[PDB]
Design a protein around this ligand. Sequence first.
Ligand SMILES: NC(=O)C1=CN([C@@H]2O[C@H](COP(=O)(O)OP(=O)(O)OC[C@H]3O[C@@H](n4cnc5c(N)ncnc54)[C@H](OP(=O)(O)O)[C@@H]3O)[C@@H](O)[C@H]2O)C=CC1
Ligand SMILES: NC(=O)C1=CN([C@@H]2O[C@H](COP(=O)(O)OP(=O)(O)OC[C@H]3O[C@@H](n4cnc5c(N)ncnc54)[C@H](OP(=O)(O)O)[C@@H]3O)[C@@H](O)[C@H]2O)C=CC1
Ligand SMILES: [Mg+2]
Ligand SMILES: [Mg+2]
Lengths: 370, 373
Amino acid sequence: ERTLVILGATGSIGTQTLDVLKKVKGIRLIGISFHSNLELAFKIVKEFNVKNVAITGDVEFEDSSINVWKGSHSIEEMLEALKPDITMVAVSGFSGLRAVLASLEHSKRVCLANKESLVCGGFLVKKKLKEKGTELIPVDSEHSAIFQVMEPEVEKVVLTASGGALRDWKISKIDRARPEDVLKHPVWNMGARITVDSATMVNKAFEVLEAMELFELPFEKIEVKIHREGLVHGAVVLPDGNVKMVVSPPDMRIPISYALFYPRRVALEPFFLRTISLSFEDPDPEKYPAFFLLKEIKDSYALRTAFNAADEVAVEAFLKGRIRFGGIHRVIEKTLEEFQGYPQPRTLDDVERIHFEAIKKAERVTEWLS
Amino acid sequence: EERTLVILGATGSIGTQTLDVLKKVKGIRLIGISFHSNLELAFKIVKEFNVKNVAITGDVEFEDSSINVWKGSHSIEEMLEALKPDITMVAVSGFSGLRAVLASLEHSKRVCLANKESLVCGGFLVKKKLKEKGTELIPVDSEHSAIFQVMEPEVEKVVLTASGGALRDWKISKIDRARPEDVLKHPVWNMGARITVDSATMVNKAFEVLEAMELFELPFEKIEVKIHREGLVHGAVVLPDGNVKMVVSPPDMRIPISYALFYPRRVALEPFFLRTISLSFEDPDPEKYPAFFLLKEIKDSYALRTAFNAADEVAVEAFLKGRIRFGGIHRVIEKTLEEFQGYPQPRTLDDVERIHFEAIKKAERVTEWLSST
Ligand SMILES: NC(=O)C1=CN([C@@H]2O[C@H](COP(=O)(O)OP(=O)(O)OC[C@H]3O[C@@H](n4cnc5c(N)ncnc54)[C@H](OP(=O)(O)O)[C@@H]3O)[C@@H](O)[C@H]2O)C=CC1
Ligand SMILES: NC(=O)C1=CN([C@@H]2O[C@H](COP(=O)(O)OP(=O)(O)OC[C@H]3O[C@@H](n4cnc5c(N)ncnc54)[C@H](OP(=O)(O)O)[C@@H]3O)[C@@H](O)[C@H]2O)C=CC1
Ligand SMILES: [Mg+2]
Ligand SMILES: [Mg+2]
């Protein structure tokens, strides 16, 4: 059996990974990390007989027949001790950057669900990947699809987007939208943040930057289309007229299983061909202004990190009632203005300093907009 | 760096589309051609491509003089032995493609296979020669090219798509009485009279299923055919996890030709741009395409597959000549196959060629019966 560690086991991706382990044999889960959801963590440790846990938040796990690592280097120290064959990196937020770097150091394969790691610190991940040679497979549905059809000479890589919860609403009504209108979603079963991110298309902006890092694509070779039905997860347009497309049901257990079991294909449920509707349209810049900030930020890890930080602050603020929907892209825009002229970060510490300064600035902007 | 090419059957549809590709991308030098009887087109290919080597497979005069000319029944094998091309495009029509593919596998580094008969009738022979030589074989057919591009060992289903042919929207009662003028109109693809009729009966698709089993080493049970009226999807693989990989492209044979010739490089032609579509996939009606549903009966026997091919060749020509109506085609095939029930599995090229010859003779007798009746 191949040994597995799931970082962020208590989250959406984490628990879907557990579901997959019940459905397919050949991997043994030997450790998990979680942040603060102790009740769920307890269920997992009992159900899966997990003897190694890294606590990442300010919570009390005790104990006493299981090894419990706690604090800021818990993930790193657990991974060094366990040296798993496979690590699923399903932590949310900016913590994903250090989690991925530690996973690359101590695992033979890293299954990457966390987006922030490549958005903010892709240059660090790429350096570590080259040095260590660790296998890295994306878990995101769109990058899993691309991974399956990618080749060296492409004309265009097409990512598809649902258009989010407000895809149908007209422009003037979107500014005023409340949380009770953004949840949800209406295509994927995901955490509260990702749902807001799909509605602003910030999620898709992250995926473009992730695709550039993962597949060494220039910005100009990527295109994003709104695709209502959510069947096509990615397509590659080749120079000869051929297009390779990947279709599947919208269930994250599919790309999870692929990343865990590659090069084997897991037996889940085959998707049988039938008459089908495939629509592809350009995102309207007036409906998705934060998405169109990509051109402005793509070349700078300082601006990419600030983009992510401001989005984290604005979504939280939106979820807590301080701003309305139209305030999200404004917080991001106004925060980015304050980082123009920043030098390109060179180290993990540089990236971390930008992130915390940007959180600080975005909070000030949010206060103004509240 | 430059690769040399021989095109067997250079004067045909595939051959001239290959020439069209060679005019608009560099890296391949045409050094030899074969043709059967189209002297006028062969000389013009020779002049315009500066070809110095020609194999004539038919009984025609091609004299002389500044070029090397091979003639008679061994002309392809002899020219290939002399030329040793890097690539041979095998685009001869009909049963002689089996001999041509085997000859090509002897003397090329890569064989681009357009000819269907070679695998339908003699797949076991081709596979044996492939193993001994270790030469590359890339299919040129657009469905096989599509599958080649997405194939992997653990597929659940390989899906070939079919236009359904000229009579796809017709009532079953009208089909039996159809004439060549009904069939020889063009729903999705631009090709010869033979391929157009085979598309209407879906015998073309029966050939492609058998070729797919040979090319990709798939059991018959893992192949699915769907009628796909848009003709945009040329093939798909269904994986056991829920993923489906599909290949979409314009219905232009220059695409898979360029892919086979230049693999692993992709030639810059005209990129296809994604847009809103419905995509239809329906099962073929057994009552509409009876000759297609003879697959399950013939699939394990090279004797039956060779007879199926021969009977088809006879029946299609008789149809085009006005001797039988469209419904007569599947009847010629069925009745000819009934005469070969129990024939032993051929073991050599010579066994295959004997079955071919007798099935042609048997199918002609059947055709006369149906014509006079
Ligand atoms: N959900 C989806 O469908 C998809 C998600 N992704 C990406 O995967 C990542 C995780 O997504 P999702 O599972 O939905 O997120 P969730 O919020 O549902 O769960 C995230 C996990 O990370 C833990 N966590 C939270 N904060 C920290 C922290 N500061 N340090 C370490 N661990 C922490 C949580 O612990 P606890 O519960 O105890 O607080 C939980 O275990 C994200 O980057 C997301 O963009 C990508 C594609 C699709
Ligand atoms: N056409 C298409 O779109 C596709 C075709 N194919 C397959 O490719 C093969 C050829 O296709 P296509 O180019 O359309 O056929 P054509 O009838 O257009 O031409 C066949 C070629 O074979 C030569 N030829 C004819 N008879 C003989 C013979 N007895 N011995 C040696 N050579 C002969 C012809 O010479 P000449 O002109 O001098 O008589 C010509 O060069 C067939 O198996 C067909 O099914 C597969 C996929 C797509
Ligand atoms: Mg995604
Ligand atoms: Mg074909």
